[PDB]
Amino acid sequence: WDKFKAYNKSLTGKADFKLFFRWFKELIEIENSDNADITALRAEIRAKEKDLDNPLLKALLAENKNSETTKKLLEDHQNSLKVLKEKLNSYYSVNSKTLHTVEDAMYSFLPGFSNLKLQRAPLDLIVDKNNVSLSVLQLSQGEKTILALIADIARRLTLLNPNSVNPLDGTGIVLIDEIDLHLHP
Amino acid sequence: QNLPSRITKLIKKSESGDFASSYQLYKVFGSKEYGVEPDEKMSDYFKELSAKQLEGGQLRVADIHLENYKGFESLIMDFSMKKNSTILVGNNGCGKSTILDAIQKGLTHLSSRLSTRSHNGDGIEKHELRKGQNYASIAINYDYMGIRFPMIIATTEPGYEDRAKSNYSGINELGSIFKTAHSINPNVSFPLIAMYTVERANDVSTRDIENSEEIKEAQIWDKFKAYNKSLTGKADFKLFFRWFKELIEIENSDNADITALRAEIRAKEKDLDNPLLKALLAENKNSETTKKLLEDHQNSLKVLKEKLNSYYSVNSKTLHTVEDAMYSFLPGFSNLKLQRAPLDLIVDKNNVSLSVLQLSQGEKTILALIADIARRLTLLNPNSVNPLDGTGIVLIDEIDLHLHPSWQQNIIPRLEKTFKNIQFIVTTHSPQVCHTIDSQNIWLLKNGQKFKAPKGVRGAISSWVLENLFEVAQRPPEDKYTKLLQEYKNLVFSEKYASEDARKLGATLSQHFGPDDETLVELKLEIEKRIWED
RNA sequence: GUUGGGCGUUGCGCCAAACUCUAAUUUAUUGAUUACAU
Numbered sequence: 001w002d003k004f005k006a007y008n009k010s011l012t013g014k015a016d017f018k019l020f021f022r023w024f025k026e027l028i029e030i031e032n033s034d035n036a037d038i039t040a041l042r043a044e045i046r047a048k049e050k051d052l053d054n055p056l057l058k059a060l061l062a063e064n065k066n067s068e069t070t071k072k073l074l075e076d077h078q079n080s081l082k083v084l085k086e087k088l089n090s091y092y093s094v095n096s097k098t099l100h101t102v103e104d105a106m107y108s109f110l111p112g113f114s115n116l117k118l119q120r121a122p123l124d125l126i127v128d129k130n131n132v133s134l135s136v137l138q139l140s141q142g143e144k145t146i147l148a149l150i151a152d153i154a155r156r157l158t159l160l161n162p163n164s165v166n167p168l169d170g171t172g173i174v175l176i177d178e179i180d181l182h183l184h185p
Numbered sequence: 186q187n188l189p190s191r192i193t194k195l196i197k198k199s200e201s202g203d204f205a206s207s208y209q210l211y212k213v214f215g216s217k218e219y220g221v222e223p224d225e226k227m228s229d230y231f232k233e234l235s236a237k238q239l240e241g242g243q244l245r246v247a248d249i250h251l252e253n254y255k256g257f258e259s260l261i262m263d264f265s266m267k268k269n270s271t272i273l274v275g276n277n278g279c280g281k282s283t284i285l286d287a288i289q290k291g292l293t294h295l296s297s298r299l300s301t302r303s304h305n306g307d308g309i310e311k312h313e314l315r316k317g318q319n320y321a322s323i324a325i326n327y328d329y330m331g332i333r334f335p336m337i338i339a340t341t342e343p344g345y346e347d348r349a350k351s352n353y354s355g356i357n358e359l360g361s362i363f364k365t366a367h368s369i370n371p372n373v374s375f376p377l378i379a380m381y382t383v384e385r386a387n388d389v390s391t392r393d394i395e396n397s398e399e400i401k402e403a404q405i406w407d408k409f410k411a412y413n414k415s416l417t418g419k420a421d422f423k424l425f426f427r428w429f430k431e432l433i434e435i436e437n438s439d440n441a442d443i444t445a446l447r448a449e450i451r452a453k454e455k456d457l458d459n460p461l462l463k464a465l466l467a468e469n470k471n472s473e474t475t476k477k478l479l480e481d482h483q484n485s486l487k488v489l490k491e492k493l494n495s496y497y498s499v500n501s502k503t504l505h506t507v508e509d510a511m512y513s514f515l516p517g518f519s520n521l522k523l524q525r526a527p528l529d530l531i532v533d534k535n536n537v538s539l540s541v542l543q544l545s546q547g548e549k550t551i552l553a554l555i556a557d558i559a560r561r562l563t564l565l566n567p568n569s570v571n572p573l574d575g576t577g578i579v580l581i582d583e584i585d586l587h588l589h590p591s592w593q594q595n596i597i598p599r600l601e602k603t604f605k606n607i608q609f610i611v612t613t614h615s616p617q618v619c620h621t622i623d624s625q626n627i628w629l630l631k632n633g634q635k636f637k638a639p640k641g642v643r644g645a646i647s648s649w650v651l652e653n654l655f656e657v658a659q660r661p662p663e664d665k666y667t668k669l670l671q672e673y674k675n676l677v678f679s680e681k682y683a684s685e686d687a688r689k690l691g692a693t694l695s696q697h698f699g700p701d702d703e704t705l706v707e708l709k710l711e712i713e714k715r716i717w718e719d
Numbered sequence: 720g721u722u723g724g725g726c727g728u729u730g731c732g733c734c735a736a737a738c739u740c741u742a743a744u745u746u747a748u749u750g751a752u753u754a755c756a757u
């Protein structure tokens with residue numbers, strides 16, 4: 001992880017789901033096989049980041065908030081995420097932080113989708129909506145190519161950008177030819 | 186309505202409890218051909234009962250009939266049913282391998298019609314015909330819960346009209362019974378069919394493990410899949426390596442979502458306690474929104490506890506059972522793990538970490554054999570208290586390969602102790618395997634004929650079993666010192682007890698064999714006795 | 720391991736006896752046989 005071992009061989013570009021499934025499989029398994037201390041931190045980041053978007057408490061916060069106690073509480077659980085992500089960043093580790101960013105790439109480019117697991121008895125890399133779905137089988141043909149491209153961009157930007165609590169906030173050139181390739185209208 | 190008498194007899198048999206009695210009862214009430222009006226509900230009941238009564242039965246080979254096969258003109262053998270181990274002993278060139286090769290080409294057919302729809306298999310080739318004859322025939326009777334299935338496979342040279350047509354009446358029956366049992370219940374235990382040829386000597390190699398992560402995903406995980414390349418010998422290790430990777434990955438991928446869930450429960454407990462948050466909520470307790478949010482948080486915490494309990498009762502013993510059953514068979518070895526740098530396995534012996542690919546040749550063949558049996562039993566037998574208690578036929582050919590004569594006295598009983606419901610028809614040439622099985626089971630073979638073992642072949646002096654089962658003398662038959670021993674012994678028991686040669690052979694045989702052994706002390710004592718008498 | 724006898728807390732439990740060429744009987748609306756209703 002010296003920022004230059006993946007910077008090269010990128011001027012050609014590859015974006016396919018066959019080489020993304022095998023990559024994500026190793027990334028989610030190797031990270032969890034050894035280490036195993038960053039897994040709990042990342043899972044609790046997921047819990048804290050998805051529990052804030054509670055419609056009940058969100059409506060209560062959006063309601064009359066003249067008392068400063070609720071503002072202090074919201075600042076406190078924002079600082080919770082701040083320090084938590086700071087701790088993960090302090091754990092300088094390749095193959096353990098790129099997973100979180102690549103998951104965030106698919107958590108935003110595909111709006112409203114929840115946690116992403118990887119079953120094994122059937123492979124079936126599942127994406128969680130309010131109802132369960134499957135990516136290896138469903139999700140069309142081009143909705144896998146574009147996701148592979150997004151994942152590659154996220155991984156490459158994360159590797160090129162150490163620290164940077166939001167690694168997918170770099171700057172540079174990314175040229176795509178015929179962006180309308182395998183897309184539903 | 187005057188139910189036929191045969192139908193009443195079948196109903197009585199089913200009431201007593203049989204599996205075929207209800208099979209031929211749900212196919213008599215589901216069609217108009219058999220002569221009774223078709224009733225669907227009362228046929229479904231019989232089908233369910235037939236499938237339910239199949240559990241607890243062992244599938245064994247009862248008898249076999251070779252006629253003009255490789256080297257046997259006419260052979261009839263009957264394998265014991267109360268005993269779970271049959272041993273074939275004979276010279277190199279009598280035909281013990283022929284009987285195993287005849288048990289296959291029928292076991293292949295049984296596996297094909299129990300797993301696939303092909304309805305094909307092996308057969309007698311032209312080169313296997315007895316030199317001079319024209320027709321050959323192999324007949325095997327399969328047993329299940331005291332009810333037998335016929336079979337016969339035959340051939341004729343394409344110059345004369347065939348005088349022995351093939352027939353597979355009973356194996357189609359057995360396959361249909363098992364398939365129906367699977368249809369009504371997806372987790373019905375099935376028998377295991379496999380043979381391990383001498384070609385398992387080179388089973389484990391670095392080449393096989395190098396590309397074991399580059400095979401198809403749907404070739405290892407389903408009940409009906411532990412049958413491909415299973416009677417070809419060459420106990421599979423690549424598929425075993427893939428299977429071991431997947432199980433260790435299930436352990437290393439789950440049990441962390443369990444840890445994550447426990448951490449989430451702790452965090453939620455902190456969030457609910459949260460003295461600041463509790464104090465803030467205490468300001469407005471009667472508010473409907475606050476009560477709603479608190480009750481929903483409590484319900485979510487209870488649901489999270491239920492989710493944790495869901496994986497709290499997994500206990501994936503699929504790995505533990507295999508590891509424990511394979512550690513006991515190979516003494517000392519323990520803590521088998523995986524190392525991902527050159528995608529290789531690591532096993533620990535005598536507090537030394539070594540790779541499987543570099544182990545002794547006498548410890549990888551047994552390793553792969555036990556691993557293949559355990560994996561196939563686990564695949565064929567779904568979720569159960571003990572998945573290694575399955576039935577079937579395992580044909581271990583030339584068990585004496587790569588074994589020190591210290592494990593041969595503990596190989597058969599250990600296989601029977603770990604696997605206590607599998608038939609183990611085997612062949613051997615080491616006389617330290619024979620003296621652990623009853624005399625009624627060993628089937629001597631010479632000159633194309635079957636001879637029963639002499640009385641008392643169980644635990645005894647190895648010289649006696651050697652002499653009375655292999656026709657090989659205890660001492661060398663042509664050795665100079667052995668000839669001197671004989672020429673000393675006969676003269677001791679005859680003229681020239683103390684003469685020209687008595688002393689010189691005495692000294693020569695005292696320099697070797699030591700001056701203190703069994704035979705020479707006997708001879709010296711008796712010569713002293715009968716020189717004192719004179 | 721297989722066969723014939725006896726008693727009755729009898730769709731078979733027990734008792735009392737025997738035999739070992741290397742080695743156990745299954746089909747109906749069919750035809751032959753025993754038996755009731757004719």
Ligand SMILES: Nc1ncnc2c1ncn2[C@@H]1O[C@H](COP(=O)(O)OP(=O)(O)O)[C@@H](O)[C@H]1O
Pocket residue numbers: 254255256276277278279280281282283284312313314315316
């Ligand atoms: N066409 C044939 N004609 C005569 N003998 C044959 C023929 N085919 C096979 N055989 C006999 O089969 C024997 C092979 O023995 P085998 O089955 O390998 O048992 P084992 O491995 O225990 O010695 C040989 O003794 C050979 O004579």
